Amino acid sequence: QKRITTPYMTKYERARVLGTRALQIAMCAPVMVELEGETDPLLIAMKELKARKIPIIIRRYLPDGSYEDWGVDELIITD
Amino acid sequence: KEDLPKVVVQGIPEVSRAVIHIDEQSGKEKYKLLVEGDNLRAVMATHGVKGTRTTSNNTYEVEKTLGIEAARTTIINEIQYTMVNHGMSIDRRHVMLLSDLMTYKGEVLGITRFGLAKMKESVLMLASFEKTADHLFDAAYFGQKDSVC
Amino acid sequence: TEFFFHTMAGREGLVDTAVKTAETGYMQRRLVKSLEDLCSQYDLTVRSSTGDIIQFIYGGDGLDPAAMEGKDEPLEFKRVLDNIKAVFPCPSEPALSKNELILTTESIMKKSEFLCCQDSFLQEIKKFIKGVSEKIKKTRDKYGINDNGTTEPRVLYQLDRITPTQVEKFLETCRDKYMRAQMEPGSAVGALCAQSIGE
Amino acid sequence: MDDEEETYRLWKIRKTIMQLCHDRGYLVTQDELDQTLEEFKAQSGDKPSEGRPRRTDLTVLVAHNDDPTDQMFVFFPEEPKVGIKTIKVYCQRMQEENITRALIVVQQGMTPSAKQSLVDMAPKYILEQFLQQELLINITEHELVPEHVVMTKEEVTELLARYKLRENQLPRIQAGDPVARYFGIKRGQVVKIIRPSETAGRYITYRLVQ
Amino acid sequence: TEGRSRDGGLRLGEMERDCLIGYGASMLLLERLMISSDAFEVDVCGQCG
DNA sequence: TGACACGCAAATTCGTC
DNA sequence: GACGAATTTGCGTGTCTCGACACG
RNA sequence: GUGUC
Ligand SMILES: [Zn+2]
């Protein structure tokens, strides 16, 4: 098993992961960080990504039907 | 008495008018032939003009004379020649991607109702562009299945 | 008579800005309806809804036209060198000649990380790194300078000084910019190119 | 001096045909490819108009280079206008020995019933037509025709296994375009296209023949 | 409905949809066309559609 | 009030009995 | 010499021909 | 139908 995909984290997947985490944290989810006093869980959803503490696995599908598993902690976040 | 002048004596009948252009440089001089016609295979298959170095403006003429792979290059230079006299700036890749959309089928297509009817394969999509009744009735008559993607 | 001839041309442009909108919007909505599902896959391939192969590699390089530096190019090598030459100044490091610069460049390039990109970009940067060395020798035999590093005129070594520490960061920065210059897998290329000829 | 221009037009089409047979894969030596005007004058006389150099005299027999037991003909109808039996006589003229592959270089316009009868019989013998007006300039070496190479099946199978796709996914090309008729490739073959450029380099593309 | 005299809303045409398509966002494109405009729950059968 | 892609149809030529 | 077959060309018809807001 | 972009 060897990965044939770019390791850089796309913005298309970054946005969807951020949205999923923001929607899940607002569902009375256990936080993976000690947050400051602040509302709008969308604002703190980026904090977990900056600290690489998001338990989400990205499954990339190929045209043939091949599945590739990637970790948010394994991806490279660049900005 | 009315058709003797109409009868040609020489040349290519559909070829209309030709002019010679003088292109100069520091010490260089060239004479380039500008032919106003469409029959590229006939104006190039002569003795004087150099048959290898001769280009046309009609996409269909270069498509039927040279080929389909050679018609995707004359359409990239044609678009870029229309954008540089306007002072606009487009990148080569935007034109190269559009030039490959109407050439991967095998035929040089145009973006109209008939060309879109031939390039794509979705019923309700084709119905949401132009005439709805025709496409819907054809789909109902044929009775094929459509995977919405 | 002059006012009439002046207002004749004012009506030439006022009737032209009223008609352009119609056929322009028509050609725009005719061009979008054909290119709106062309997407890039994760194996550097653009396909339509069916699965057909449109192009094996978008453009030929797989680079986003938006993020580019210089008339079509990923990045300019002279400008990044001009930037990194002044942001990291340290006189403690001495200078070097061209015959050693070439070996250092080709020694640091043959690494485990640099063997991931196209060798065309590597030859393109080898054409620029080689050309900088020819500029150094002409300036060195211009005034007369020995490269052993002992000559009492001290300012003659500050004309074009190239140190091996700041040349590694330049290579790393340009190679990393070439990584981000690649178009992202999943971008809608058809809809993006459909509107580029609109305005 | 009109026959001089006719002989020039004939030498042009002869050289183009030789270059085509050479690029296809047939075995021809260089001096036959690179023959000058005076070198052509010593083999075939120019005057009178079409006397000593008859069109029946122009009938070239090329040999396949990789496969010895294979020979191809290419000939010129003596007649300006083509008929039905006028092609059948030349078909049965070279059908008699062991030959299957021949080319017709048609001088002027073509008969539709003739081409229909041509497309009627292709189990054993294949005859392909070429207009003399069409074969007066090299098509691959013109200005902007990217380098095409017809590939093999052992390579197209690994190409399909490379990108994990099917032949239907590959872009299709016509069978009646001048390039395909030049290389003589009908359905079931992939062509590689080398697109040159001096910005980054040259790119590789693959196409299917329909 | 149409118009302010009846307290209506705004229209989202195709040219503004093309801007959302060129970006590549699918969640918001579906949220403000199906979730906030008209969300309906229908039932059909598997034997005959 | 421009665009040409579809059919529908009549004048005309190579061909074989 | 006379009849069936297939080609090229003048002529018939259908579809639209950018967006948004406000008032009567 | 009128008015603005
Ligand atoms: Zn039911």
Query: Quick check: C54 contacting B, CB < 8 Å?
Result: yes
Contacts of E27 in chain A (CB under 8 A): 16, 19
Rounded to 5 degrees, φ, ψ at A30 are -70, 125
Q: D146, D193 in Cβ contact below 8 A?
A: yes
Nearest Cα to D173, choosing from D181, D161, D162? D181
Number of Cβ atoms within 10 Å of the Cβ of D173: 26
User: For chain A, what's the residue count?
Assistant: 79
Query: CA separation (Å) from C83 to B88, C122, C167?
Result: 30, 21, 12
Residue with tokens 């073959």: D189
Q: Which residues make beta-bridge pairs with D195?
A: D203
List protein-proximal bases of chain G (any atom < 7 A from a CB).
6-7, 15-24
Nearest Cα to C30, choosing from B129, D155, B86? B129
Residue D147 to residue D192: CA distance in whole angstroms: 8
Distance D71 CA to G6 C1' (A): 35
Residue C194 to residue B94: CA distance in whole angstroms: 8
Technique used to solve these coordinates: cryo-EM
Residue with tokens 């094996």: C56
Contacts of B92 in chain C (CB under 8 A): 59, 72
D111 touches strand F (CB under 7 A): yes
Whether residue C43 and residue D201 make contact (CB cut-off 8 A), yes or no, is: no
Rounded to 5 degrees, φ, ψ at C144 are 100, 100
- Nearest-Cα residue of chain C relative to residue A4: C43
Phi-psi group of C189: left, alpha or beta (phi > 0 → left; psi -120 to 50 → alpha; rest → beta): alpha
Three-state SS at C195: coil
Residue D78 to residue C160: CA distance in whole angstroms: 77
Residue B84 to residue B81: CA distance in whole angstroms: 6
Return the amino acid letter for A47: K
Token pair of C104, please? 């250092």
Token pair of B67, please? 């080929």
Provide the terminal-to-terminal Cα distance of chain E, rounded to the nearest Å: 32
Cα within 13 Å of Cα(D103), Cβ side: 24
Resolution attained, angstroms: 2.9
State CA D157 to chain mean position distance.
27
Return the amino acid letter for E26: S
Task: Give the nucleotide with minimal C1' distance to the Cα of B118.
Answer: F5
Residue D43 to residue D10: CA distance in whole angstroms: 14
Residue B81 to residue B55: CA distance in whole angstroms: 14
Element (H, E) at D203: strand D203-209
Distance C26 CA to G23 C1' (A): 30
DSSP B38-71: S-HHHHHSSSSS-SSS---S-HHHHHHHT-STTH
Return the amino acid letter for D138: N
Nearest Cα to C171, choosing from C134, C129, C132, C133? C129
Q: C28, B61 in Cβ contact below 8 A?
A: no
D196 touches strand F (CB under 7 A): no
Residue B75 to residue B82: CA distance in whole angstroms: 11
Whether residue D165 and residue A62 make contact (CB cut-off 8 A), yes or no, is: no
Give the residue ranges of DSSP H helices in C47-157: 77-87, 98-109, 119-143
Residue D96 to residue D73: CA distance in whole angstroms: 13
Token pair of C41, please? 């896959």
Structural domain boundaries in chain D: 1-137, 138-210
> Which of B44, B65, B66 to mutate to test binding with chain D, by most D CBs within 10 Å of its CB?
B66
User: For chain E, what's the residue count?
Assistant: 49
Return the amino acid letter for C64: D
- Nearest-Cα residue of chain A relative to residue C44: A5
Return the amino acid letter for B51: G
Q: C195, E18 in Cβ contact below 8 A?
A: yes
